[PDB]
Design goal:
Layout lengths: L39 E2 L13 H10 L8 E2 L8 H21 L7 H26 L6
Antiparallel strand pairs: 1-2
Helix pairs in contact: 1-3, 2-3
Membrane topology: Lipid-anchor; GPI-anchor
Family: Belongs to the prion family.
Protein name: Major prion protein
Length: 142
């Protein structure tokens, strides 16, 4: 198209983290990526869970959770990211990369498997929101 994204940017009025700031750290030794380069992951979460309110869904999503991705791929906030697009392209790409890289060797994911992943993979990006949100709020802490 002629462009993409919006110059309009919005956050939440509630501060994104508690007043007690903390240290963090990271390291790298390479990464296993679905041939992206421009889409990388941050961290993994402690068991993403969705709430479907159905016995068969709460069972199936948890049975296949063993095969779901542990992480998502995203871009830093950089004070110029849309709050929704951050999470929304996250899972879109992640499922595309995982479902392909897994099926490439012999695997398959049905509609339901994908549906559970859509919410699960999205939920892991929502948690990464808070991780990366501190990065823009590192300088723009007001």
């Amino acid at each position: 198209g002629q462009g993409g994204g919006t110059h309009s940017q919005w956050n939440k009025p509630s501060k994104p983290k508690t007043n007690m700031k903390h240290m963090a750290g990271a390291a790298a030794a390479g990464a296993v990526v679905g041939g992206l380069g421009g889409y990388m992951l941050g961290s993994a979460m402690s068991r993403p869970i969705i709430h479907f309110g159905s016995d068969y869904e709460d069972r199936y999503y948890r049975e296949n959770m063993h095969r779901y991705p542990n992480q998502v791929y995203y871009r830093p906030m950089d004070e110029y990211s849309n709050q929704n697009n951050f999470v929304h392209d996250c899972v879109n790409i992640t499922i595309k990369q995982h479902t392909v890289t897994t099926t490439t060797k012999g695997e398959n994911f049905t509609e339901t498997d994908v549906k559970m992943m859509e919410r699960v993979v999205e939920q892991m990006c929502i948690t990464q929101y808070e991780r990366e949100s501190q990065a823009y709020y590192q300088r723009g802490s007001s």
